[PDB]
Amino acid sequence: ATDMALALNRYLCTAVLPLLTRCAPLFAGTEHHASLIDSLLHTVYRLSKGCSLTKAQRDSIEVCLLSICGQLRPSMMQHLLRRLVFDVPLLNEHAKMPLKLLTNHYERCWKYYCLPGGWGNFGAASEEELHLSRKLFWGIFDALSQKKYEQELFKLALPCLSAVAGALPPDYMESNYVSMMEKQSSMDSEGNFNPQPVDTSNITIPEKLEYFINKYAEHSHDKWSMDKLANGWIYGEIYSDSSKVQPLMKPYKLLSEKEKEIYRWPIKESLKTMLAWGWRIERTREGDSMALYNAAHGYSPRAIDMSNVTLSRDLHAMAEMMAENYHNIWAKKKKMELESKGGGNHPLLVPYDTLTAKEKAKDREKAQDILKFLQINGYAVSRGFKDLELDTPSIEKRFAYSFLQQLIRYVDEAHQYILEFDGGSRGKGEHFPYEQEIKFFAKVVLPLIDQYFKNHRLYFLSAASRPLCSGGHASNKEKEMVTSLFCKLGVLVRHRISLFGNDATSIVNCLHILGQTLDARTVMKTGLESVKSALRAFLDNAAEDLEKTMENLKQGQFTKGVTQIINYTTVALLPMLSSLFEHIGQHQFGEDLILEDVQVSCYRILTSLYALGTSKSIYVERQRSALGECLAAFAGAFPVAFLETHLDKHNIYSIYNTKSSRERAALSLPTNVEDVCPNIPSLEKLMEEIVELAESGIRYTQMPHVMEVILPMLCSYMSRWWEHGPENNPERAEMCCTALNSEHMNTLLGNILKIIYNNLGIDEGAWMKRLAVFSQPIINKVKPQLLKTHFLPLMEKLKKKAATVVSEE
């Protein structure tokens, strides 16, 4: 509230921070100034947390810190992420800037956190860093779930959560690493800074190290003698600093133990902190051999110079650890001193992470000196010997115990969401069962899982047999539970589209992505029977809904509920089935998926699809567009020949060929391999149909369902049944199933090309873009000898339309 605080804040936010914002690009590489820039970021975030600031000042803080962090290298500001990880979850009012900063940082460092090699020339995230990210992720879940609905707060929370989820590598990260590291932090983490040095009262030095203590006391006396002759002190029999004479420049060998105990005191404190932290010292034969192996006045003017000795990297982190403890002890002592005095505020009271290198110099040099004296005398300090067992090596700790499987388990939010709708639909009210949880799910969970599955596209379908990902592949039973997220399919019932409201598009897009993210082979090979039952039950329900749609299109039902059922089909059921079936056909998962009862449901689905395609009623006239994408998807997915029925016995995946003992007649069956398709399509029938098509002077606008549904059937059908063995040895289990694919598909190559040519010859056309997409896989099969003399008329028709368009306009 003082005028100095206001004036200083104005000066900063008007001159200093904007200048740093302007010159932010200069912060690309600061390998020298890790501590300096960490102090900068910590101070800036402390100013941000500080109150009594205007909106413009807060905006300046936000933009400056965002620019600096964005330009900064990922390796540093680890401590800034520590403070943010502790502060953001409980915070819901000042968390705007920290949340945006975390979003930007994770979006930038997406590769660094996830890819095992890291970003590139920057290494990978440390185990502590990724554990901190884990803590942030789960704390944000807890806070977001518990907090009330705030539109802007959630609009920031969702992108940050998606970015953190994408950055954290789902395969292993640490598998929660059992998390045996519990490093105490000052409650600068829990508010303002007070230091809490680790108590060593119960710690007692062993009676063994005292040779080392005595020797380092000798070295300390040597260093203080260096002070003596640097300051110019002279030997004296009495203490008189005014006359510039040094009291008793005389060896510790015969000095009294009192001041020798004063030298010993820092040594004892250092070793007691050592043992309280629980590291212990090992003694080599080099040091022990030296221990057993080893004029008047004139105290030694020579001391062993230790700055030349180098230190290992782990021991350097150790030295930093002792340095931060020492600064904590000093800060605590100064804190009691200022509390005894009146409201003292020393500038160096900030924590060690906020300190700068110049202030860290004394603590760092003291810790490095004691460690180097240890090393020279031959004593090696040992770190993880305590709790040396961790039991992970990624062998006993399968999957990710607390990120991946815990996330997919917390997807039980979807199951409880289904239960909430089941309770509420019986008289849905304005207050809802629990509107907070309803809004939380609707505005968080669906986009979160959508973006997460889009980001980790490659991991879930990565398998040991097929290396989709260079890193670890998806795990057993975790692929199964990924499939079990088909509770999202158990929800979105015919009547729930309006209940979701505008979230219908979001949920169907999420469902598109999740269905694309599926491993049917693993699910069937190693999966839970309830999950298999859920999958087959949803596909049976989809077949039942399609049959209901046929009861609707019969016109005996439409003549409200029927309209909303049709709308449900059009907006969700047909696109999601189209996507799932495209995915399974692309990955050749249809053979494993469609075996017996799914096969029955798929024949029901087929009868439905061909029936709506041939339905000339105007009700499905708009829908005929995506109906085309769906039947092409199913034609490319289903593993048994549709329009060839005389080869059902030859086919090995046929329902009768698999269950001809009793089950085919046990189930509802058409009783004949030709009767499985009561519809018309037969071989030469549809050859002759597509031949007379566009040759009998037909028009798309006259009747478009033929070239809108039948050709896509043919396209995907010949695509995958020419994936079925091309030009192998016939009758040898490679073309028993097809055989006849050898030449008729090759001729109807030119048939479809000529149909397209006539479709261009007729005056108007825009649908062939869909037909061109459907024909794309076919022209891959087309060899150069029959692209010549066949695509030249395509050029002729192209220039014909170009000339007509130019002449008309």
Binding site: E286, S289, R302, I304, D305, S307, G378, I395, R398
Partner: protein, 723 residues
């Protein structure tokens, strides 16, 4: 005989000692480094199972396993047709062990049980989880009967448990393969501990068995025997019902980097003089293998030890990662396969490069066809390629246009010219040199610095070696080998205040080294080396130095002389001091003394003579040398001083100063260091040798008749020769 050392799946071939030393054409195979774990073959590394603890369930099922192993063994014997016999008769198909297990010979019974418990202990050892499936099923599954043919003549009843319903999972099959490998390992280890070895023919007299090979090399017959026996073992376990789960498969991250420490990749480039500075140029790179390989255009100053594209010196394409390399890497194009063709073209007068794979233009992340579109001409570009471990390439410069397999498809229309479009003779190759050589420390070296301290009335001339980058970013911390540019030559024949006359007469020379305080003396080796020293090893010790002992003398009248020949005569500074640890108040001084009249090498510690000495052959050239691993900004300092009754080093180095007691460090003398940054020129023509096998009796004829000579330039002070 030497033919007995052939691996069973290989044939003898009298081939060249070197790899490129074949008279060929542009079709020459350029070979990268080779993975160097080829012939180690058998090194028994069994799985240690003595440390593990046996759970009680496995403990009391152990005797069931041993028993059922006994029945399965007797079943195999009886179904093959064996019968009881006091002596081993393989041809007669008689077996002594086909006995009732209780009455069976005790030593054979100890075998039958040791296989069992070692098998289960291995199962435990490599991390297989044992769990209960159904103890009720374990009690239910019993042994059915066997016919009289399957009944053995010993009177016992082979009792087969229910093998019919037992199924095997692929994970169990894989762990059983591991078990078979381990069993073969332990068996052959025991065989060698008896004292057997490997041979192409099985001989009891010489105790050679062709089965002492790695399990991969092991023939299927014994391998299938292990397979089937282990089938019965694993199906016994599954019938007992205690289900096993092997640990999940672990990915391989070794990266197959098994090349020598000198090389991880090999760079082949055109000669610098063939650098092109204007026009359209094209060349071809066939990839016999698919792997870590790069091809492109390099500046004349490109370094052989650095990867292509990691610096501004080269513009390369790496199809292994489908990337383009110049001062970093970016995604570019697709990845080749085996036997593909990469056409590299540069159009330099508007400064563009493009690459084609099998005649198809390669694109950037965008649709741009230009791999690199803005590079200054500078000093020109030359074709270059880099190959990693076990990689085979071919570069076609277009000397014969018909040889180019994709020039017509891409480049002939664009007007690009083959690199050797009109050349009367073959282009000259230059390769990354494999053997390190000593060369003067560059003034711009990143790590080490050499300063020449002029001698004074109090201090002798010195050459101080310091580390520029010590304590700095990612500084190299490896043993580096320094030497002096001029050698001391021993006498051609061996005879069989200091005194001025003794100084004048003597042929004894001295130099010293000062290892500075704070530099680990155990990391500094001081002495002399010859011109044959080229061992750049990260871990150097005085025990791995090359050494031979030539002994001359009639064996009837015993050896009358033995001479020890070596290329390194040094002592470790830490071992030289050994006054305990410490005493590093001042820099440690080690003095090397050579008497050239007698070829005697002695060393002196800080005032005291050391116990290590050497005796060299006459006319030996010894280079002063220090091998140091830097643990200080200041490591060591050559001191060209002198001691009592010993001449300075300059006297023996320089003929003009032969009788000058005043120590000197003339500018010719300098500090060289072992390095890999050098190029080797492939000869334009090799010796035409014919190798064939005349017959079984005659042998392998090799024949070379056409003479071939080259003119050798000799550097005398370095004792070196080049083409």
């Amino acid at each position: 005989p030497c033919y007995e050392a052939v691996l069973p799946k290989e044939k003898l071939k009298v081939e060249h000692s070197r790899e490129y030393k074949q008279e060929r054409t542009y079709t020459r195979d350029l070979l990268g480094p080779t993975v160097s774990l080829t012939q180690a073959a058998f090194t028994p590394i069994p799985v240690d199972t003595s440390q593990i603890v046996l759970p009680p369930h496995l403990e009391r099922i152990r005797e069931k396993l041993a028993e059922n192993i006994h029945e399965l063994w007797v079943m195999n014997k009886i179904e093959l047709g064996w019968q009881y016999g006091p002596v081993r008769d393989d041809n007669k198909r008689q077996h002594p062990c086909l006995v009732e297990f209780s009455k069976l010979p005790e030593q054979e019974r100890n075998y039958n049980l040791q296989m069992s418990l070692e098998t289960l202990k291995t199962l435990l050892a490599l991390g297989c989880h044992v769990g209960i499936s159904d103890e009720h099923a374990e009690d239910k599954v019993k042994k059915m009967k066997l016919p009289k043919n399957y009944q053995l003549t010993s009177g016992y009843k082979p009792a087969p448990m229910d093998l019919s319903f037992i199924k095997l999972t692929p994970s169990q099959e894989a762990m059983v393969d591991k078990l078979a490998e381990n069993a073969h390992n332990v068996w052959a280890r025991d065989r060698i501990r008896q004292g057997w070895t490997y041979g192409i023919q099985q001989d009891v007299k010489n105790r050679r068995n062709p089965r002492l090979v790695p399990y991969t090399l092991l023939d299927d017959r014994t391998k299938k025997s292990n397979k089937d026996s282990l089938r019965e073992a694993v199906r016994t376990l599954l019938g007992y019902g205690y289900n096993l789960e092997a640990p999940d498969q672990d990915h391989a991250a070794r990266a197959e980097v098994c090349s020598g420490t000198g090389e991880r990749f090999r760079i082949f480039r055109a000669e610098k003089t063939y650098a092109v500075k204007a026009g359209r140029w094209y060349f071809e790179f066939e990839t016999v293998t698919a792997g870590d390989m790069r091809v492109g255009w390099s500046r004349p100053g490109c370094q052989p030890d650095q990867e292509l594209g990691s610096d501004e010196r080269a513009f390369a394409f790496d199809g292994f990662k489908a990337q383009r390399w110049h001062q970093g890497n970016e995604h570019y194009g697709r990845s080749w396969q085996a036997g593909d063709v990469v056409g590299c073209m540069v159009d330099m007068n508007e400064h563009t490069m493009m690459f084609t794979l099998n005649g198809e233009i390669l694109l950037d992340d965008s649709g741009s066809e230009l791999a690199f579109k803005d590079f200054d001409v500078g000093d020109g570009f030359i074709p270059v390629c880099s190959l990693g471990v076990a990689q085979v390439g071919r570069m076609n410069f277009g000397k014969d246009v018909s040889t180019l397999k994709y020039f017509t498809i891409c480049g002939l229309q664009e007007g690009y010219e083959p690199f050797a479009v009109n050349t009367n003779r073959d282009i000259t190759m230059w390769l990354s040199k494999r053997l390190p050589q000593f060369l003067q420390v560059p003034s711009n070296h990143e790590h080490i610095e050499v300063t020449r301290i002029d001698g004074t009335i109090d201090s002798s001339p010195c050459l101080k070696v310091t580390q520029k980058s010590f304590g700095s970013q990612n500084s190299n911390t490896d043993i580096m080998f320094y030497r002096l540019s001029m050698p001391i030559e021993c006498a051609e024949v061996f005879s069989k205040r200091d005194d001025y006359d003794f100084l004048m007469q003597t042929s004894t020379y001295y130099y010293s080294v000062r290892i500075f305080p704070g530099q680990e003396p155990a990391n500094v080796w001081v002495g002399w080396i010859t011109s044959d020293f080229h061992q750049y090893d990260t871990g150097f010790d005085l025990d791995r130095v090359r050494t031979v002992t030539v002994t001359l003398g009639d064996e009837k009248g015993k050896v009358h002389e033995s001479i020890k020949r070596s290329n390194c005569y040094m002592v470790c500074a830490g071992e030289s001091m050994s006054p305990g640890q410490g005493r590093n108040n001042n820099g440690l001084e080690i003095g090397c003394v050579v008497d050239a009249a007698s070829g005697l090498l002695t060393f002196i510690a800080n005032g005291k003579e050391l116990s290590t000495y050497y005796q060299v052959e006459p006319s030996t050239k010894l280079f002063p040398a220090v091998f140091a691993q830097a643990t200080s900004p200041n490591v060591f300092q050559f001191e060209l001083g002198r001691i009592k009754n010993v001449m300075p080093l300059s006297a023996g180095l320089f003929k003009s100063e032969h009788k000058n007691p005043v120590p000197q460090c003339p500018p010719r003398l300098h500090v060289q260091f072992l390095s890999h940054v050098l190029w080797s020129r492939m000869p334009n023509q090799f010796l035409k040798v014919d190798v064939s096998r005349i017959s079984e009796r005659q042998g392998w004829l090799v024949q070379c008749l056409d003479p071939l000579q080259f003119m050798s330039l000799h550097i005398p002070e370095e004792n070196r020769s080049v083409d």
